[PDB]
A paper describes a structure:
Protease-activated receptor 2 ([name]) is a transmembrane receptor that is irreversibly activated by proteolytic cleavage of its N-terminus via extracellular proteases, resulting in the release of the tethered ligand (TL), which binds to and activates the receptor. Combining functional assays with structural analysis, our study revealed that TL forms a parallel β-sheet with the extracellular loop 2 of [name] to engage the receptor. The binding of TL triggers a conformational rearrangement in the transmembrane core, releasing the inhibitory ion lock and allowing receptor activation.
The structures of the [name]/Gq and [name]/G13 complexes were elucidated through single-particle analysis by cryo-EM, and resolutions of 3.25 Å and 3.2 Å, respectively, were achieved by the gold-standard criterion of Fourier shell correlation (FSC) = 0.143. In the [name]/Gq complex, the density of the Nb35 region is notably lower than that in other parts of the complex. Our previous studies on receptors capable of coupling to multiple G proteins suggest that polar interactions play a crucial role in Gq and Gs engagement, whereas hydrophobic interactions are the main driving force for Gi and G13 engagement because of the distribution of hydrophobic and hydrophilic residues at the far end of αH538,39. The binding poses of TL in the Gq and G13 complexes are very similar, with minor differences noted: (1) the carboxyl group of D62N-term faces TL in the G13 complex but turns away in the Gq complex; and (2) the side chain of I39TL3 faces D62N-term in the G13 complex but turns away in the Gq complex.
Residue numbers in the entry:
A (entry chain B): 3 to 340
B (entry chain G): 12 to 61
C (entry chain R): 37 to 42, 57 to 359
D (entry chain A): 13 to 62, 205 to 253, 264 to 394
Write the structure that this text describes.
């Protein structure tokens, strides 16, 4: 009759709201306002890399804090060493629209995908020295927006058809499929222990997922529009989200509520990428105002500003040993800050 | 509607803690590794590859 | 420019009339002061914008910055000249400065001319043949800028190797470039000045005029799309204006220069000096008119300038 | 000095390859094709012929065109339309003999005209299926007044250029349909991009020439803007 089910859903939502309002005993701006302010943080460019003909859409750091991968709408993958600005590899693509990259934790493989509705998996260590495509995964019905590795045998993938999936490399078949979103899935992140992951999908909503089960653990709401970036806190019990309403927010996983909201009255632009630092104090963000901001996590104030790009900042990343920060924007240049 | 009801039912029964506990844990982790971050505490120029 | 006979020198009656009159003690300093006050900040601001806030080096900026610098260096030592003219045609400031003033004036004028010509040719090359490459243009622009400057610093040497100040006791005056000996006007200087007047004005004039006329005739052809008229028509207007500020402000000076030296080396008299002073007054106004025609009639440049201040 | 000898070899080889690729790339033009389901964009594509997104290439007077058709996607497109900010022309193909889904066509045109990431791109407008329009108007069983009553106040402009043999009624209909789009085009008054209308049918072979002429004009306007001449 469609009436009883909606009534039960409303009752359950009311119960959840009461449970969440019961645990909201204080605001964290009250028990974090007597700490030593970080100060003034300023950074300068140490190097600049050239060679792309068009916009840079994504990038990723390796596990040695030395080698990196980047890719553009030219149809080009480039593998750099950042110690000496010299190139090591260049790979051409079979399609000209690609929107995500990755880097295997062992240094042997790379992965890519785009509007062609297919994932491409490339091998780097061959006896002939020539990089040739190894695997190719198809089965989605929409543009592919992110892809990461767990080991050399499994790849987790997110697409624009409101679904996510886990793939087994050898057989070429999906092992499990995650459904439950209602709109375009854009941002994905893996837990540091490689046990869970988190996703956000253009409905002003975010969700947590277990890998081996295949069902939602918990769902968070609170934004006003699409969600574009997502990342884990280093310790494994928090994540910070960026949206198109000019706001960053922080959530934990045990209280199911907002903790800090970072925003400003003079900002009416979007967020394109977000990342964290090793200790957990510095939060970096890239905006459409042609610049980037650096914030502190426990204070809800500003610390500094990075400038130097002539277009939108599209990709950002911070290394595994904490030594440098890399950025790439629509002007076809990558920059490194320390 | 049935799927939404099932989702809300499974989400309802979750153990929850107080916010100040999570705040304490986060500030504790921030303090414990404060000295090892090469951006809050800048590295001496000698050992910096950059 | 005026002939002094024969060290004590002497001059004739018309020269005496002009050197102590009101044309060269009242009129000229007004023009120079107005030019100075109007033109110094304009090129200063243009050069600031072209040097600091530019993000990418397009060829047009490469040529325009050089033109602006040429005008700026042309307009520096004017106060010395106003002080000269107001004191009654008498120079009391030494010897090096006379050479500096003459050389910088003439060299910077002709550098301005050559850069105008280069802009014209590149505009033709782009519009009447749409295909091109930006980086090769940047390389060629830098090369040609260096060539032009080095050529200029090689035809202002003969003005540093001739004594320019001459003493006249009959009036108690000392003169910087207005009086010169007869045994030099009929000789070396005749050759040098006709060489400059026919070498670095006429040929660039033909090049520039031909390029702009062909561009207009192609932009009004009956083989172009009719959904663009309101833009193309505007373009025509600007082109005409530029030609107008080129031929009017430069042809009279060179013509009267040639005529003056022809009268001196042909017959032996001189009664055309006042017209040359006035035509040169007209020529020196382009240090103030150029930034309003090549720089400010656009869209983005005005916004950048407003953001600068 | 060191033992690192690939540190020059690999860099030099890769630089050579990228230079060759740059010279190949910068001489091509790229176009995006949009339309509805009942539009005849597929027939046009097949005529100048000689999953994700479909792709075609053609060559006119030694210039290479590369055209992109959006394929098996979902209905909502507000997120991947931002990947087309560096193309020269949007080719918009709209039906002309339906009278029902025409308003949705105008509204979509308005939406793609005022988007923020596409305020420096021009539109070439193709109105397809003309002979059907002629036959349908001559049949006279359906009146345009039931959907655009303002047609009752429209008269042919004095500068009309009809091909001989056509009744003035069909000419009036054609010009009214064109006028709606042109007015919505000029409504902004932005003065940074232009709309180029044409009429076309199911069997015609001069579409490549039209695209070439329009692209040539677009490049010329860009160059005039760039050199402080306009």
């Amino acid at each position: 009759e469609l009436d009883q089910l909606r009534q039960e859903a409303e009752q359950l939502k009311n119960q959840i709201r009461d449970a969440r309002k019961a645990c909201a005993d204080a605001t964290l701006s009250q028990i974090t306002n007597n700490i030593d302010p970080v100060g003034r943080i300023q950074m300068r460019t140490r190097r600049t890399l050239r060679g792309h003909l068009a916009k840079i859409y994504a990038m990723h750091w390796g596990t040695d804090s030395r080698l990196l991968v980047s890719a553009s709408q030219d149809g080009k993958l480039i593998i750099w060493d950042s110690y000496t600005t010299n190139k090591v590899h260049a790979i051409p693509l079979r399609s000209s629209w690609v929107m995500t990259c990755a880097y295997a934790p062992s240094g042997n493989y790379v992965a890519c995908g785009g509007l062609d509705n297919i994932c491409s998996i490339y091998n780097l260590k061959t006896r002939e020295g020539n990089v040739r495509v190894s695997r190719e995964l198809a089965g989605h019905t929409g543009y592919l927006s992110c892809c990461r590795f767990l080991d050399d045998n499994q790849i987790v993938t997110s697409s624009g058809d409101t679904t996510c999936a886990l793939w087994d490399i050898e057989t070429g078949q999906q092992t499990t499929t995650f459904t439950g979103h209602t709109g375009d899935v854009m941002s994905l992140s893996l837990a540091p222990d490689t046990r869970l992951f988190v996703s956000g999908a253009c409905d002003a909503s975010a969700k947590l997922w277990d890998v081996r089960e295949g069902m939602c653990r918990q769902t968070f709401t609170g934004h006003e529009s699409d969600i574009n970036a997502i990342c884990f806190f280093p310790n494994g019990n928090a994540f910070a989200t960026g949206s198109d309403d000019a706001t960053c927010r922080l959530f934990d996983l045990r209280a199911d509520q907002e903790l800090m909201t970072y925003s400003h009255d003079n900002i009416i632009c979007g967020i394109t990428s977000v990342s964290f630092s090793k200790s957990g104090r510095l939060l970096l963000a890239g905006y459409d105002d042609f610049n980037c901001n650096v914030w502190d996590a426990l204070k809800a104030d500003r610390a500094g500003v990075l400038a130097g790009h002539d277009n939108r900042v599209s990709c950002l990343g911070v290394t595994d040993d904490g030594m440098a920060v890399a950025t790439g924007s629509w002007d076809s240049f990558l920059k490194i800050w320390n | 509607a049935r799927k939404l009801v099932e989702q809300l039912k499974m989400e309802a029964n979750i153990d929850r803690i107080k916010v100040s506990k999570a705040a304490a844990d986060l500030m504790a982790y921030c303090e414990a590794h404060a000295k090892e971050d090469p951006l809050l505490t800048p590295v001496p120029a000698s050992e910096n590859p950059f | 420019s005026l002939i002094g006979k024969v060290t004590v020198f002497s001059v004739d009656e018309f020269s005496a009339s002009v050197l102590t009159g009101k044309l060269t003690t009242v009129f000229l300093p007004i023009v120079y002061t107005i030019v100075f006050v109007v033109g110094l900040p304009s090129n200063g601001m243009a050069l600031w914008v072209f040097l600091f806030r530019t993000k990418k080096k397009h060829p047009a900026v490469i040529y325009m910055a050089n033109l602006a610098l040429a005008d700026l260096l042309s307009v520096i030592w004017f106060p010395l000249k106003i002080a000269y003219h107001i004191h009654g045609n008498n120079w009391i400031y030494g010897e090096a400065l006379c050479n500096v003033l003459i050389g910088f004036f003439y060299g910077n004028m002709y550098c301005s001319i050559l850069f105008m010509t280069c802009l014209s040719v590149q505009r033709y090359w782009v519009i009447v043949n749409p295909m091109g490459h930006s980086r090769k243009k940047a390389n060629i622009a830098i090369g040609i800028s260096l060539a032009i400057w080095l050529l200029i610093l090689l035809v202002t040497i003969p003005l540093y190797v001739v004594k320019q100040t001459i003493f006249i006791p009959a009036l108690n005056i000392t003169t910087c470039h207005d009086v010169l000996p007869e045994q030099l006007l009929v000789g070396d200087m005749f050759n040098y000045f006709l060489s400059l007047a026919i070498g670095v004005f006429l040929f660039p004039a033909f090049l520039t005029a031909s390029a702009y006329v062909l561009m207009i005739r192609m932009l009004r052809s009956s083989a172009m799309d009719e959904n663009s008229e309101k833009k193309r028509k505007r373009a025509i207007k600007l082109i005409v204006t530029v030609l107008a500020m080129y031929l009017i402000c430069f042809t009279p000076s060179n013509l009267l220069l040639v005529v003056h030296y022809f009268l001196i080396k042909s017959q032996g008299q001189s009664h055309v000096y006042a017209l040359y002073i006035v035509a040169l007054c007209l020529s020196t106004l382009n240090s103030c008119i150029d930034p309003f025609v090549y720089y400010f009639v656009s869209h983005d440049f005005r916004d950048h300038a407003k953001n600068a201040l | 000095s060191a033992e690192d000898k690939a540190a020059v070899e690999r860099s030099k080889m890769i630089e050579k390859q990228l230079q060759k690729d740059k010279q190949v790339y910068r001489r091509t033009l790229r176009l995006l094709l949009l339309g509805a389901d009942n539009s005849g964009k597929s027939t046009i594509v097949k005529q100048m012929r000689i999953s994700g997104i479909f792709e075609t290439k053609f060559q006119v007077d030694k210039v290479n065109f590369h055209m992109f058709d959006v394929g098996a996607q979902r209905d909502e497109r507000r997120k991947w339309i931002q990947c087309f900010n560096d193309v020269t022309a949007i080719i918009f193909v709209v039906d002309s003999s339906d009278y029902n889904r025409l308003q949705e066509a105008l509204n979509d045109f308005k939406s793609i005209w005022n988007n923020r990431w596409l305020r420096t791109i021009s539109v070439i407008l193709f109105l397809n299926k003309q002979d059907l329009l002629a036959e349908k108007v001559l049949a006279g069983k359906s009146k345009i007044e039931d959907y655009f009553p303002e047609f009752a106040r429209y008269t042919t402009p004095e500068d009309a250029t009809p091909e001989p043999g056509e009744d003035p009624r069909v000419t009036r209909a054609k010009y009214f349909i064109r006028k709606e789009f042109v007015d919505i085009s000029t409504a902004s008054g932005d003065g940074r991009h232009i709309c180029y209308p044409h009429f076309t049918c199911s069997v015609d072979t001069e579409n490549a020439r039209r695209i070439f002429n329009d692209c040539k004009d677009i490049i010329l306007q860009m160059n005039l803007r760039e050199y402080n001449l306009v």
